[PDB]
Amino acid sequence: HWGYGKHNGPEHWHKDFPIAKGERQSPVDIDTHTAKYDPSLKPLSVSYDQATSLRILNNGHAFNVEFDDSQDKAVLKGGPLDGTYRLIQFHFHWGSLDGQGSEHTVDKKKYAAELHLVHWNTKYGDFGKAVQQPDGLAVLGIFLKVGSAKPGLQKVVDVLDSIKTKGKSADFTNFDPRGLLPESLDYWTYPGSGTTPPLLECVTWIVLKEPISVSSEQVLKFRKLNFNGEGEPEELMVDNWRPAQPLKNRQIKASFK
Ligand SMILES: O[n+]1ccccc1S
Ligand SMILES: [Zn+2]
């Protein structure tokens, strides 16, 4: 099955998921000189004060911090979006080394990691329905660079020991995702896809320009997770990122000059 090794990595995925060579795949390189400022873009509205985290799960490809999305509690709206999108989960993609790990790139620059806050359009009733629609998901992407620690990330880093291997979960209540946001909500936006199989073309991407800083110790702890199940040969969970895909007939818009 798919993953991130020599044999089942991104260059293989098209054989089970032909959409991998489609017209609106993600990630992409953000060429900052080609992106057009769009003064009609609104400020993003991130309303996370009522967010209800529940659980953290190692799914064999990353870890997902899951939220209660049975009511409008943590929502994204505004920006390029019409309507209201509910937070369902966040996860990260990261590298074996600080010089790689992000999925989007900025003028070909790779960051150490990238956070994806996944939200689904409430007009479609459920996440499973929303992923079948071209405007079903909105993913807020935030880059991570290694420098100062991110205090709001430390509760995530400290639970990782308890979900080392694939299929492990742990209770993860009362986590406030506002502590993962940078100061500025200036963003780039474009239409694309999920970056793991099934690679559905249902995502409005909103990528924040300002990274967050995490410490070397914080990202080292991500790198101690395992892709394998318990009792299986250890394969460290690193380099769980898809590289940049062709932009094709798309334009990346900037909310700022
Ligand atoms: O990687 N990924 C997994 C699930 C949903 C979105 C994304 S970006
Ligand atoms: Zn992702």
Swiss-Prot record:
Changing residue 103 to A/Q: Strongly reduced CO(2) hydrase activity. One of its GO terms (molecular function) is carbonate dehydratase activity. InterPro entries: CA_dom, CA_dom_sf, Carbonic_anhydrase_a-class, Carbonic_anhydrase_a-class_CS. Zn(2+) binds at residues 91, 93, 116. Keywords: Acetylation, Cell membrane, Cytoplasm, Disease variant, Lyase, Membrane, Metal-binding, Osteopetrosis, Phosphoprotein, Zinc. The modification Phosphoserine is found at residues 162, 169. Changing residue 61 to G: Impaired activity, not rescued by 4-methylimidazole (4-MI). Changing residue 198 to A: Normal CO(2) hydrase activity, but impaired stability. Changing residue 196 to H: Higher affinity for bicarbonate. Enhanced proton transfer capacity. Changing residue 118 to A/G/I/L/S: Reduced CO(2) hydrase and p-nitrophenyl acetate esterase activities. Gene3D superfamilies: Alpha carbonic anhydrase. Activated by X-ray, histamine, L-adrenaline, L- and D-phenylalanine, L- and D-histidine, L-His-OMe and beta-Ala-His (carnosine). Changing residue 139 to G: Weakly impaired activity. GO terms for biological process: angiotensin-activated signaling pathway; carbon dioxide transport; morphogenesis of an epithelium; neuron cellular homeostasis; positive regulation of cellular pH reduction; positive regulation of dipeptide transmembrane transport; positive regulation of synaptic transmission, GABAergic; regulation of chloride transport. It is found in: Cytoplasm; Cell membrane. Substrate binds at residues 195-196. One of its GO terms (cellular component) is cytosol. It catalyses: hydrogencarbonate + H(+) = CO2 + H2O; urea = cyanamide + H2O. Changing residue 196 to S: Enhanced p-nitrophenyl acetate esterase activity, but normal CO(2) hydrase activity. It is an enzyme of class 4 (lyase). Optimum pH is 6-8. It is linked to Osteopetrosis, autosomal recessive 3: A rare genetic disease characterized by abnormally dense bone, due to defective resorption of immature bone. Osteopetrosis occurs in two forms: a severe autosomal recessive form occurring in utero, infancy, or childhood, and a benign autosomal dominant form occurring in adolescence or adulthood. Recessive osteopetrosis commonly manifests in early infancy with macrocephaly, feeding difficulties, evolving blindness and deafness, bone marrow failure, severe anemia, and hepatosplenomegaly. Interacts with SLC4A4. Interaction with SLC4A7 regulates SLC4A7 transporter activity. Interacts with SLC26A6 isoform 4 (via C-terminus cytoplasmic domain). Target of drugs used in treatments against glaucoma disorder and breast cancer. This is Carbonic anhydrase 2. It comes from Homo sapiens. The gene is CA2.
